[PDB]
Amino acid sequence: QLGHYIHIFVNTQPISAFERTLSSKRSSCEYDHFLLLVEWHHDGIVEHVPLDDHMDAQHLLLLITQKHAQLILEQIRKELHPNIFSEHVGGGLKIHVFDNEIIVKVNSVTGRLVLSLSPPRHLRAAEKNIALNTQPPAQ
Amino acid sequence: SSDTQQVQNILELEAKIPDILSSAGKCIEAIQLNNSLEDFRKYSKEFLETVEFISTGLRRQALELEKAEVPVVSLQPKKRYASTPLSNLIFDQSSKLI
Amino acid sequence: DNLEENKNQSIEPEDFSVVRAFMQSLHSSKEAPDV
Amino acid sequence: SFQRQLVQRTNTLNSSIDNATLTILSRFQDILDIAINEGKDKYTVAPEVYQIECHTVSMVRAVEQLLDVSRQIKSYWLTNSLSTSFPTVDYSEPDLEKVKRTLTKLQNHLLEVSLIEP
Amino acid sequence: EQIMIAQTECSLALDMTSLLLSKFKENSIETISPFLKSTVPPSSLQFSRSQPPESKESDATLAKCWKEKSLTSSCKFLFEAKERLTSVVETEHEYYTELVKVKEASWPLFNSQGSNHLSVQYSCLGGISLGLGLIRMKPESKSFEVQSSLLYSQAALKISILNKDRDEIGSSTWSWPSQNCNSVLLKDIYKLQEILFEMDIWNSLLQEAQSCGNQGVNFTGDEILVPISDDHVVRITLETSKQEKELLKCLCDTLNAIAHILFLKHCRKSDRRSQQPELYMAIDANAPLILRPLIFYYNLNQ
Amino acid sequence: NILLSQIHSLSNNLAAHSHTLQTTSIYPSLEFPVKEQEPLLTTLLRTKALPEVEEWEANTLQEYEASISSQPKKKEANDAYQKDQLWDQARIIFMEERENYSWFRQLEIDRATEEQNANQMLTDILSFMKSGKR
Amino acid sequence: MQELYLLGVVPSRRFEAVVNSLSKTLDGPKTILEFWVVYRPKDVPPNLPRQPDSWLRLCSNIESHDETDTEWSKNTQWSMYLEGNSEPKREDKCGIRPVNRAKLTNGSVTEFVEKMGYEFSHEYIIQGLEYFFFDTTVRIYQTLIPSQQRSIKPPFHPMNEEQPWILHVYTHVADASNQVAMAKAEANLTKVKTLLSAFCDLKNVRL
């Protein structure tokens, strides 16, 4: 968008509350021990998403950034005015009379915000402004 | 010779070598079997010619390749887009596409 | 099976599924608690 | 320099020719030296078979090498660029006008055109 | 096995001769096999002066007959090798005759990989991504059939108009003009050319699908969804492995033809003329925008 | 080939060395252990080759004698000295034809001279594009 | 405008064969036709800039113009150049010469350099071929001397009509202050040198 990444590893969760509460039968005292890890980053937060096949390569790149996506949808929406109801139907920006889409592009940015037929420079301006990156868009 | 023709010269030069081994096995046969000096007296006047004359033909194919001066490096092609026959033939298809 | 002076420039397994490095990691990990 | 490229290259080719061919020369040559029998112990006669073996096998070997260098030189003659674009099929030139009818009329489809007007 | 026997026996030669020469110089017994020095002390063996000793006719007779057999073995070698070499000529010649069909018919030739074969550019006429066929001998074929990275047996570009139920409406499919050259090999060069062609085009297009959404056009990521009027999808994707409906086949004509013809326009546009006023008229990047302007004629028609 | 080097030097060392070796005879001396160590040394005293291969040499004798059965009385060795002697002369004639031969343009290097001064001529026009002196 | 460039002669005997190794794999061919006037500002006092670049170079591109048409001299497009010299210690390295690519628009054209009073000097015509690589391009040379002063009519006058093809890869930097286009374009055109090395030997020459 200018890193912004996920390292992938292996985890452990010892806790005595299940551990030795049984032990020496159907709960081994040792494990000993290792699991899985996927740490989201940039910025200031780390998701600890469940890690379980069946799985596809796209999910960590997508679904995580889709949570991130609707978090942006509420980001601008609460940075926005009450007068204009941003919905999850598709970023329905509401420059009345017109009501139009707000979306961030998957992968490389230049967000997929869209007018409802053929759009002029408006999308081109906001999105080349996204190419500028600086000065976040809300006001 | 031009284009493939030098290479073609080598192509029919190909069979010119293996039978030299027949001439040579017979070079052995001249005294090992036939027991006649005259035979190898002829085939030493043949084996060396059948070999070396081909060798000279080769070395001259190479030296005159070195005169023809074909570049050895393969050009890395630009992503080519459309040669003219391709373009107008595509247009012919477009007529067919009408 | 059983099993199954030229050119240089051209177009511009590992039968182990990176199993080799996995075994290496097993060497590191068998004593990972121990070391 | 581009010069020494092809020059030292072809020189390697001819040098290789010198290699395999001289190999054939000497290996075919000394078999004649191997022919001696009298005045030598029978056990000393034993190696001569292996000697002839290595000579002849070296010969056909060097011949194969010559096939190699020959194929190489083939590639060098043939690695040259095509003089231009080369003929294929340019047969039957497409209509200019059916194209125009497709363009216009299919784009003019369901339209009240008033011709051209002055 | 055999080399084990003979060579180790020779090791015994070195060892026992070392036992003999260990009577004087000590820098000889040192090379004996390790078990021996642990056992028998050096300087053990000793030579004796004795006898001519004997001789027999078998000496000269075998000395003759074995040399006879040797030179004759050389004869059999030269002759049978002559056979295999001549056969190699017989095989190899077909390759370069088919290369008369190649180079003497003016076709690209380049050094290749570990295949030892040529690296002909089947895509000599051009497209986008470069293409060179891996020439490959096929003993069944007498000739030498060539293939690339394809898993697909054949490929092109199906198109059709999905309804609201995504039922068929308009439809068509791409077809190349048919080469009829004397060499079927060159014809397959044309075929693989056609494949790399459909590749580079549709791959470039769906790669360009990027900002298709500005006038409602969308994507399953499989191909081109076209959410325009009356809920429809002009599906356009790679091949597996009345008069007004014929005129629907004609809308499909403008699509099929003029799109590839825009592959050609982009054969012009990939020439990187990259003219500035269009750069004012466009954002990113080298992208032809094969799609939008035409359907803009279509929606201006609307 | 390396083995050919081995047989080369070894056969080289057979030479007149055999003239001395024929009188030679192996025997273990005073430090040689006596109780039961001997038999392996008897194998060391055993000049026997492969029994199958000695059988092969016997096969060569008996079957050359079978050729003699095909050819009951035919001396050849006396003139076989001239077999190998004709090898000895024909090898020399072979060498003669070898010496008669020519063996392995340089002008190609002078092709570089064409681009020698052409580079200097490259210096020429640039000097005009530079100074323009006439 | 910091042009980066090299030089390598091509004999005409191998020229078009080289072009086959070029134009098929490159943009173009584009024939060049541009009438020079390298006017010399004979001026006082020393130390004059006096360097060949310091002398003015009006540059009339005329490649689309007729070989006999009369409106050319001040109607067909002109230009002007002083240009900085290529860098000192630019050994083997592509020469880096900053360039003032002048343009103009009036029926008066040449006149202003004589409005600056500058004297006439040597003249020629770029007439080689050029093959694109984005902002970078190669420019193999032909610089025939014109048959007469201010005469567009051929035959012209190469120092030999066995004219060297002064092959010349180049690029044009906007500004030399950053390292970016420096190493970048030097790399791209060094690879271009690897391309020509399949059929030629370019070199730097001092300027």
PDB file of N, CA and C in Angstrom, chain B residues 2-5 7-8 11-12 14-15 18-19 21-26 28-29 32 72 74-75 77-83 85-87 89-91 93-94 96-98, chain E residues 67-68 71-72 74-75 78-79 81-82 85-86 89 93 96 99-100 103-104 110-111 124-130 174-177 179 193 253 257 261 264 267 270-271:
ATOM      1  N   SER B   2      24.642 -23.142 -49.004  1.00  0.00           N
ATOM      2  CA  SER B   2      24.055 -22.031 -48.265  1.00  0.00           C
ATOM      3  C   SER B   2      22.898 -22.528 -47.408  1.00  0.00           C
ATOM      4  N   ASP B   3      22.596 -21.804 -46.336  1.00  0.00           N
ATOM      5  CA  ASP B   3      21.553 -22.207 -45.395  1.00  0.00           C
ATOM      6  C   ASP B   3      21.841 -23.587 -44.814  1.00  0.00           C
ATOM      7  N   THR B   4      20.978 -24.544 -45.137  1.00  0.00           N
ATOM      8  CA  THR B   4      21.128 -25.907 -44.648  1.00  0.00           C
ATOM      9  C   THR B   4      22.172 -26.698 -45.425  1.00  0.00           C
ATOM     10  N   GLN B   5      22.569 -26.176 -46.580  1.00  0.00           N
ATOM     11  CA  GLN B   5      23.336 -26.958 -47.543  1.00  0.00           C
ATOM     12  C   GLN B   5      24.698 -27.408 -47.029  1.00  0.00           C
ATOM     13  N   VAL B   7      25.199 -28.026 -43.835  1.00  0.00           N
ATOM     14  CA  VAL B   7      24.745 -29.039 -42.907  1.00  0.00           C
ATOM     15  C   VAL B   7      24.314 -30.277 -43.671  1.00  0.00           C
ATOM     16  N   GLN B   8      23.692 -30.068 -44.828  1.00  0.00           N
ATOM     17  CA  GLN B   8      23.282 -31.170 -45.687  1.00  0.00           C
ATOM     18  C   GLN B   8      24.500 -31.914 -46.218  1.00  0.00           C
ATOM     19  N   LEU B  11      25.385 -34.077 -43.783  1.00  0.00           N
ATOM     20  CA  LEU B  11      24.379 -35.124 -43.658  1.00  0.00           C
ATOM     21  C   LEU B  11      24.665 -36.293 -44.570  1.00  0.00           C
ATOM     22  N   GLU B  12      25.084 -36.002 -45.792  1.00  0.00           N
ATOM     23  CA  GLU B  12      25.476 -37.091 -46.670  1.00  0.00           C
ATOM     24  C   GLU B  12      26.939 -37.448 -46.444  1.00  0.00           C
ATOM     25  N   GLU B  14      27.732 -38.138 -43.532  1.00  0.00           N
ATOM     26  CA  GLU B  14      27.529 -38.998 -42.369  1.00  0.00           C
ATOM     27  C   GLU B  14      27.856 -40.460 -42.619  1.00  0.00           C
ATOM     28  N   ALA B  15      27.358 -40.993 -43.728  1.00  0.00           N
ATOM     29  CA  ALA B  15      27.543 -42.402 -44.047  1.00  0.00           C
ATOM     30  C   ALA B  15      28.927 -42.655 -44.626  1.00  0.00           C
ATOM     31  N   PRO B  18      31.249 -44.446 -41.448  1.00  0.00           N
ATOM     32  CA  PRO B  18      31.180 -45.790 -40.858  1.00  0.00           C
ATOM     33  C   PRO B  18      31.803 -46.908 -41.700  1.00  0.00           C
ATOM     34  N   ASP B  19      31.732 -46.815 -43.024  1.00  0.00           N
ATOM     35  CA  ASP B  19      32.261 -47.873 -43.883  1.00  0.00           C
ATOM     36  C   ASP B  19      33.783 -47.842 -43.948  1.00  0.00           C
ATOM     37  N   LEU B  21      35.419 -48.038 -41.467  1.00  0.00           N
ATOM     38  CA  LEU B  21      35.677 -49.145 -40.561  1.00  0.00           C
ATOM     39  C   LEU B  21      35.661 -50.491 -41.280  1.00  0.00           C
ATOM     40  N   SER B  22      34.883 -50.598 -42.354  1.00  0.00           N
ATOM     41  CA  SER B  22      34.934 -51.808 -43.166  1.00  0.00           C
ATOM     42  C   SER B  22      36.276 -51.863 -43.862  1.00  0.00           C
ATOM     43  N   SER B  23      36.695 -50.708 -44.368  1.00  0.00           N
ATOM     44  CA  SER B  23      37.972 -50.616 -45.061  1.00  0.00           C
ATOM     45  C   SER B  23      39.124 -50.936 -44.117  1.00  0.00           C
ATOM     46  N   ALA B  24      38.945 -50.617 -42.837  1.00  0.00           N
ATOM     47  CA  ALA B  24      39.979 -50.807 -41.822  1.00  0.00           C
ATOM     48  C   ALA B  24      40.020 -52.236 -41.297  1.00  0.00           C
ATOM     49  N   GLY B  25      38.846 -52.836 -41.146  1.00  0.00           N
ATOM     50  CA  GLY B  25      38.781 -54.219 -40.729  1.00  0.00           C
ATOM     51  C   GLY B  25      39.405 -55.034 -41.837  1.00  0.00           C
ATOM     52  N   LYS B  26      39.186 -54.591 -43.071  1.00  0.00           N
ATOM     53  CA  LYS B  26      39.863 -55.195 -44.205  1.00  0.00           C
ATOM     54  C   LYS B  26      41.354 -54.846 -44.222  1.00  0.00           C
ATOM     55  N   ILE B  28      43.069 -54.859 -41.642  1.00  0.00           N
ATOM     56  CA  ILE B  28      43.564 -55.916 -40.779  1.00  0.00           C
ATOM     57  C   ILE B  28      43.543 -57.234 -41.539  1.00  0.00           C
ATOM     58  N   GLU B  29      42.494 -57.412 -42.333  1.00  0.00           N
ATOM     59  CA  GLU B  29      42.261 -58.653 -43.061  1.00  0.00           C
ATOM     60  C   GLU B  29      43.351 -58.900 -44.094  1.00  0.00           C
ATOM     61  N   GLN B  32      46.113 -60.451 -41.627  1.00  0.00           N
ATOM     62  CA  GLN B  32      45.482 -61.350 -40.656  1.00  0.00           C
ATOM     63  C   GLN B  32      44.768 -62.517 -41.321  1.00  0.00           C
ATOM     64  N   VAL B  72      26.957 -16.987 -32.459  1.00  0.00           N
ATOM     65  CA  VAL B  72      26.693 -18.150 -31.620  1.00  0.00           C
ATOM     66  C   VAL B  72      25.627 -17.863 -30.569  1.00  0.00           C
ATOM     67  N   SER B  74      22.328 -16.828 -28.905  1.00  0.00           N
ATOM     68  CA  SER B  74      20.943 -16.667 -29.290  1.00  0.00           C
ATOM     69  C   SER B  74      20.483 -15.320 -28.779  1.00  0.00           C
ATOM     70  N   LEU B  75      19.887 -14.527 -29.658  1.00  0.00           N
ATOM     71  CA  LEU B  75      19.279 -13.285 -29.228  1.00  0.00           C
ATOM     72  C   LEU B  75      18.158 -13.624 -28.274  1.00  0.00           C
ATOM     73  N   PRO B  77      14.727 -12.888 -27.653  1.00  0.00           N
ATOM     74  CA  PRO B  77      13.712 -12.172 -28.417  1.00  0.00           C
ATOM     75  C   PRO B  77      12.985 -11.177 -27.537  1.00  0.00           C
ATOM     76  N   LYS B  78      12.605 -10.035 -28.094  1.00  0.00           N
ATOM     77  CA  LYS B  78      11.632  -9.204 -27.418  1.00  0.00           C
ATOM     78  C   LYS B  78      10.358 -10.018 -27.467  1.00  0.00           C
ATOM     79  N   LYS B  79       9.459  -9.819 -26.510  1.00  0.00           N
ATOM     80  CA  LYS B  79       8.130 -10.373 -26.680  1.00  0.00           C
ATOM     81  C   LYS B  79       7.597  -9.878 -28.014  1.00  0.00           C
ATOM     82  N   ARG B  80       7.682 -10.721 -29.035  1.00  0.00           N
ATOM     83  CA  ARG B  80       7.172 -10.345 -30.347  1.00  0.00           C
ATOM     84  C   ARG B  80       5.653 -10.308 -30.297  1.00  0.00           C
ATOM     85  N   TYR B  81       5.059  -9.463 -31.128  1.00  0.00           N
ATOM     86  CA  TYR B  81       3.640  -9.183 -31.035  1.00  0.00           C
ATOM     87  C   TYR B  81       2.895  -9.676 -32.266  1.00  0.00           C
ATOM     88  N   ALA B  82       3.240  -9.133 -33.426  1.00  0.00           N
ATOM     89  CA  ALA B  82       2.603  -9.555 -34.664  1.00  0.00           C
ATOM     90  C   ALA B  82       3.467  -9.287 -35.889  1.00  0.00           C
ATOM     91  N   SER B  83       3.876 -10.355 -36.565  1.00  0.00           N
ATOM     92  CA  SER B  83       4.479 -10.231 -37.885  1.00  0.00           C
ATOM     93  C   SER B  83       3.368  -9.921 -38.872  1.00  0.00           C
ATOM     94  N   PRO B  85       2.518 -11.232 -41.883  1.00  0.00           N
ATOM     95  CA  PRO B  85       1.652 -12.323 -42.341  1.00  0.00           C
ATOM     96  C   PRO B  85       0.652 -12.757 -41.273  1.00  0.00           C
ATOM     97  N   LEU B  86       1.069 -12.700 -40.015  1.00  0.00           N
ATOM     98  CA  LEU B  86       0.181 -13.069 -38.930  1.00  0.00           C
ATOM     99  C   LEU B  86      -0.981 -12.094 -38.877  1.00  0.00           C
ATOM    100  N   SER B  87      -0.677 -10.812 -39.025  1.00  0.00           N
ATOM    101  CA  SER B  87      -1.693  -9.786 -38.877  1.00  0.00           C
ATOM    102  C   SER B  87      -2.735  -9.872 -39.970  1.00  0.00           C
ATOM    103  N   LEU B  89      -3.284 -12.279 -42.026  1.00  0.00           N
ATOM    104  CA  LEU B  89      -3.978 -13.564 -42.017  1.00  0.00           C
ATOM    105  C   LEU B  89      -5.065 -13.571 -40.951  1.00  0.00           C
ATOM    106  N   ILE B  90      -4.790 -12.911 -39.834  1.00  0.00           N
ATOM    107  CA  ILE B  90      -5.800 -12.756 -38.804  1.00  0.00           C
ATOM    108  C   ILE B  90      -6.950 -11.949 -39.366  1.00  0.00           C
ATOM    109  N   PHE B  91      -6.625 -10.997 -40.229  1.00  0.00           N
ATOM    110  CA  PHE B  91      -7.658 -10.233 -40.904  1.00  0.00           C
ATOM    111  C   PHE B  91      -8.478 -11.127 -41.830  1.00  0.00           C
ATOM    112  N   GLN B  93      -9.041 -14.215 -41.305  1.00  0.00           N
ATOM    113  CA  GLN B  93      -9.919 -14.900 -40.388  1.00  0.00           C
ATOM    114  C   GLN B  93     -11.067 -13.991 -40.018  1.00  0.00           C
ATOM    115  N   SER B  94     -10.786 -12.700 -39.903  1.00  0.00           N
ATOM    116  CA  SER B  94     -11.814 -11.755 -39.506  1.00  0.00           C
ATOM    117  C   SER B  94     -12.876 -11.712 -40.580  1.00  0.00           C
ATOM    118  N   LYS B  96     -13.504 -14.342 -42.328  1.00  0.00           N
ATOM    119  CA  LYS B  96     -14.179 -15.590 -42.008  1.00  0.00           C
ATOM    120  C   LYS B  96     -15.016 -15.411 -40.747  1.00  0.00           C
ATOM    121  N   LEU B  97     -14.587 -14.486 -39.894  1.00  0.00           N
ATOM    122  CA  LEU B  97     -15.292 -14.198 -38.650  1.00  0.00           C
ATOM    123  C   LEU B  97     -16.512 -13.317 -38.883  1.00  0.00           C
ATOM    124  N   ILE B  98     -16.656 -12.804 -40.097  1.00  0.00           N
ATOM    125  CA  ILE B  98     -17.848 -12.047 -40.446  1.00  0.00           C
ATOM    126  C   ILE B  98     -19.027 -12.991 -40.641  1.00  0.00           C
TER     127      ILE B  98
ATOM    128  N   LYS E  67      46.707 -63.935 -30.775  1.00  0.00           N
ATOM    129  CA  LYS E  67      46.837 -62.707 -31.555  1.00  0.00           C
ATOM    130  C   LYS E  67      45.918 -62.721 -32.765  1.00  0.00           C
ATOM    131  N   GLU E  68      45.733 -63.908 -33.336  1.00  0.00           N
ATOM    132  CA  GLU E  68      44.839 -64.062 -34.470  1.00  0.00           C
ATOM    133  C   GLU E  68      43.432 -63.704 -34.027  1.00  0.00           C
ATOM    134  N   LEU E  71      43.146 -59.808 -33.432  1.00  0.00           N
ATOM    135  CA  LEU E  71      42.998 -58.968 -34.609  1.00  0.00           C
ATOM    136  C   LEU E  71      41.652 -59.210 -35.276  1.00  0.00           C
ATOM    137  N   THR E  72      41.208 -60.462 -35.260  1.00  0.00           N
ATOM    138  CA  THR E  72      39.885 -60.766 -35.782  1.00  0.00           C
ATOM    139  C   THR E  72      38.799 -60.138 -34.920  1.00  0.00           C
ATOM    140  N   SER E  74      39.157 -57.377 -33.447  1.00  0.00           N
ATOM    141  CA  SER E  74      39.189 -56.003 -33.916  1.00  0.00           C
ATOM    142  C   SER E  74      38.397 -55.853 -35.205  1.00  0.00           C
ATOM    143  N   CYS E  75      38.435 -56.880 -36.048  1.00  0.00           N
ATOM    144  CA  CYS E  75      37.695 -56.837 -37.305  1.00  0.00           C
ATOM    145  C   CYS E  75      36.195 -56.854 -37.051  1.00  0.00           C
ATOM    146  N   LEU E  78      35.197 -53.494 -35.688  1.00  0.00           N
ATOM    147  CA  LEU E  78      35.107 -52.426 -36.675  1.00  0.00           C
ATOM    148  C   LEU E  78      33.898 -52.595 -37.582  1.00  0.00           C
ATOM    149  N   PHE E  79      33.564 -53.841 -37.887  1.00  0.00           N
ATOM    150  CA  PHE E  79      32.464 -54.098 -38.801  1.00  0.00           C
ATOM    151  C   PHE E  79      31.100 -53.916 -38.137  1.00  0.00           C
ATOM    152  N   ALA E  81      30.519 -52.259 -35.432  1.00  0.00           N
ATOM    153  CA  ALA E  81      30.439 -50.840 -35.097  1.00  0.00           C
ATOM    154  C   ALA E  81      30.102 -50.029 -36.337  1.00  0.00           C
ATOM    155  N   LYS E  82      30.597 -50.476 -37.484  1.00  0.00           N
ATOM    156  CA  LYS E  82      30.206 -49.864 -38.743  1.00  0.00           C
ATOM    157  C   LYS E  82      28.712 -50.002 -38.958  1.00  0.00           C
ATOM    158  N   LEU E  85      26.892 -47.605 -36.494  1.00  0.00           N
ATOM    159  CA  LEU E  85      27.116 -46.221 -36.893  1.00  0.00           C
ATOM    160  C   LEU E  85      26.329 -45.875 -38.142  1.00  0.00           C
ATOM    161  N   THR E  86      26.279 -46.814 -39.078  1.00  0.00           N
ATOM    162  CA  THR E  86      25.515 -46.597 -40.292  1.00  0.00           C
ATOM    163  C   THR E  86      24.039 -46.465 -39.941  1.00  0.00           C
ATOM    164  N   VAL E  89      23.370 -43.153 -38.649  1.00  0.00           N
ATOM    165  CA  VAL E  89      23.245 -42.214 -39.751  1.00  0.00           C
ATOM    166  C   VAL E  89      21.831 -42.257 -40.309  1.00  0.00           C
ATOM    167  N   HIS E  93      19.536 -38.825 -40.015  1.00  0.00           N
ATOM    168  CA  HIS E  93      19.324 -38.044 -41.233  1.00  0.00           C
ATOM    169  C   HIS E  93      17.896 -37.495 -41.332  1.00  0.00           C
ATOM    170  N   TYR E  96      17.305 -34.019 -39.732  1.00  0.00           N
ATOM    171  CA  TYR E  96      17.756 -32.842 -40.441  1.00  0.00           C
ATOM    172  C   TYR E  96      17.089 -32.688 -41.793  1.00  0.00           C
ATOM    173  N   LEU E  99      14.369 -30.981 -40.777  1.00  0.00           N
ATOM    174  CA  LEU E  99      14.946 -29.653 -40.623  1.00  0.00           C
ATOM    175  C   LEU E  99      15.225 -28.981 -41.960  1.00  0.00           C
ATOM    176  N   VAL E 100      15.127 -29.723 -43.054  1.00  0.00           N
ATOM    177  CA  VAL E 100      15.062 -29.067 -44.346  1.00  0.00           C
ATOM    178  C   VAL E 100      13.675 -28.458 -44.396  1.00  0.00           C
ATOM    179  N   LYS E 103      14.382 -25.290 -41.410  1.00  0.00           N
ATOM    180  CA  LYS E 103      15.256 -24.192 -41.785  1.00  0.00           C
ATOM    181  C   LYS E 103      15.285 -23.894 -43.277  1.00  0.00           C
ATOM    182  N   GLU E 104      15.142 -24.911 -44.120  1.00  0.00           N
ATOM    183  CA  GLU E 104      15.262 -24.632 -45.542  1.00  0.00           C
ATOM    184  C   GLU E 104      13.936 -24.026 -45.982  1.00  0.00           C
ATOM    185  N   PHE E 110      17.520 -22.301 -32.590  1.00  0.00           N
ATOM    186  CA  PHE E 110      18.310 -21.830 -31.469  1.00  0.00           C
ATOM    187  C   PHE E 110      18.745 -23.005 -30.615  1.00  0.00           C
ATOM    188  N   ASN E 111      19.828 -22.811 -29.875  1.00  0.00           N
ATOM    189  CA  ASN E 111      20.245 -23.771 -28.869  1.00  0.00           C
ATOM    190  C   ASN E 111      19.193 -23.944 -27.779  1.00  0.00           C
ATOM    191  N   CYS E 124       7.199 -17.619 -33.902  1.00  0.00           N
ATOM    192  CA  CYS E 124       7.974 -16.698 -34.720  1.00  0.00           C
ATOM    193  C   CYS E 124       7.140 -15.519 -35.206  1.00  0.00           C
ATOM    194  N   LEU E 125       5.836 -15.731 -35.342  1.00  0.00           N
ATOM    195  CA  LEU E 125       4.955 -14.687 -35.848  1.00  0.00           C
ATOM    196  C   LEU E 125       4.568 -13.699 -34.749  1.00  0.00           C
ATOM    197  N   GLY E 126       4.817 -14.078 -33.497  1.00  0.00           N
ATOM    198  CA  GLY E 126       4.611 -13.191 -32.366  1.00  0.00           C
ATOM    199  C   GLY E 126       3.270 -13.252 -31.656  1.00  0.00           C
ATOM    200  N   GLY E 127       3.234 -12.681 -30.453  1.00  0.00           N
ATOM    201  CA  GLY E 127       2.050 -12.666 -29.608  1.00  0.00           C
ATOM    202  C   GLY E 127       2.272 -11.799 -28.379  1.00  0.00           C
ATOM    203  N   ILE E 128       2.426 -12.426 -27.214  1.00  0.00           N
ATOM    204  CA  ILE E 128       2.925 -11.718 -26.034  1.00  0.00           C
ATOM    205  C   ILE E 128       4.091 -12.506 -25.445  1.00  0.00           C
ATOM    206  N   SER E 129       3.809 -13.410 -24.508  1.00  0.00           N
ATOM    207  CA  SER E 129       4.878 -14.156 -23.857  1.00  0.00           C
ATOM    208  C   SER E 129       5.575 -15.036 -24.878  1.00  0.00           C
ATOM    209  N   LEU E 130       6.894 -15.106 -24.771  1.00  0.00           N
ATOM    210  CA  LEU E 130       7.713 -15.811 -25.744  1.00  0.00           C
ATOM    211  C   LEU E 130       7.443 -17.308 -25.727  1.00  0.00           C
ATOM    212  N   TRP E 174     -13.762 -18.925 -30.629  1.00  0.00           N
ATOM    213  CA  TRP E 174     -12.675 -18.546 -31.528  1.00  0.00           C
ATOM    214  C   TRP E 174     -12.233 -19.666 -32.463  1.00  0.00           C
ATOM    215  N   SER E 175     -11.835 -19.287 -33.675  1.00  0.00           N
ATOM    216  CA  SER E 175     -11.226 -20.225 -34.612  1.00  0.00           C
ATOM    217  C   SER E 175     -10.122 -19.571 -35.442  1.00  0.00           C
ATOM    218  N   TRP E 176      -8.936 -20.173 -35.414  1.00  0.00           N
ATOM    219  CA  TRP E 176      -7.829 -19.759 -36.271  1.00  0.00           C
ATOM    220  C   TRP E 176      -8.046 -20.055 -37.742  1.00  0.00           C
ATOM    221  N   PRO E 177      -7.498 -19.194 -38.608  1.00  0.00           N
ATOM    222  CA  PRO E 177      -7.402 -19.528 -40.030  1.00  0.00           C
ATOM    223  C   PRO E 177      -6.505 -20.753 -40.208  1.00  0.00           C
ATOM    224  N   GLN E 179      -3.779 -23.099 -41.636  1.00  0.00           N
ATOM    225  CA  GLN E 179      -2.580 -23.334 -42.429  1.00  0.00           C
ATOM    226  C   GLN E 179      -2.667 -24.694 -43.101  1.00  0.00           C
ATOM    227  N   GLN E 193       1.686 -22.280 -31.723  1.00  0.00           N
ATOM    228  CA  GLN E 193       1.563 -20.838 -31.846  1.00  0.00           C
ATOM    229  C   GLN E 193       0.170 -20.375 -31.463  1.00  0.00           C
ATOM    230  N   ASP E 253     -19.673 -12.169 -33.335  1.00  0.00           N
ATOM    231  CA  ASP E 253     -18.646 -11.958 -34.345  1.00  0.00           C
ATOM    232  C   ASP E 253     -17.817 -10.751 -33.988  1.00  0.00           C
ATOM    233  N   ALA E 257     -14.066 -11.616 -33.069  1.00  0.00           N
ATOM    234  CA  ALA E 257     -13.131 -11.063 -34.023  1.00  0.00           C
ATOM    235  C   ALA E 257     -12.433  -9.866 -33.428  1.00  0.00           C
ATOM    236  N   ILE E 261      -8.603  -8.898 -32.603  1.00  0.00           N
ATOM    237  CA  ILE E 261      -8.113  -7.837 -33.444  1.00  0.00           C
ATOM    238  C   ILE E 261      -7.603  -6.724 -32.544  1.00  0.00           C
ATOM    239  N   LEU E 264      -4.371  -7.573 -31.605  1.00  0.00           N
ATOM    240  CA  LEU E 264      -3.506  -7.084 -32.667  1.00  0.00           C
ATOM    241  C   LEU E 264      -3.244  -5.589 -32.482  1.00  0.00           C
ATOM    242  N   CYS E 267      -0.871  -5.558 -30.216  1.00  0.00           N
ATOM    243  CA  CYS E 267       0.408  -5.915 -30.805  1.00  0.00           C
ATOM    244  C   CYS E 267       1.048  -4.626 -31.249  1.00  0.00           C
ATOM    245  N   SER E 270       1.740  -2.712 -27.626  1.00  0.00           N
ATOM    246  CA  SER E 270       2.811  -3.302 -26.847  1.00  0.00           C
ATOM    247  C   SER E 270       4.137  -2.848 -27.432  1.00  0.00           C
ATOM    248  N   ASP E 271       4.046  -2.105 -28.529  1.00  0.00           N
ATOM    249  CA  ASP E 271       5.212  -1.544 -29.193  1.00  0.00           C
ATOM    250  C   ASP E 271       5.704  -0.369 -28.362  1.00  0.00           C
TER     251      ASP E 271
END
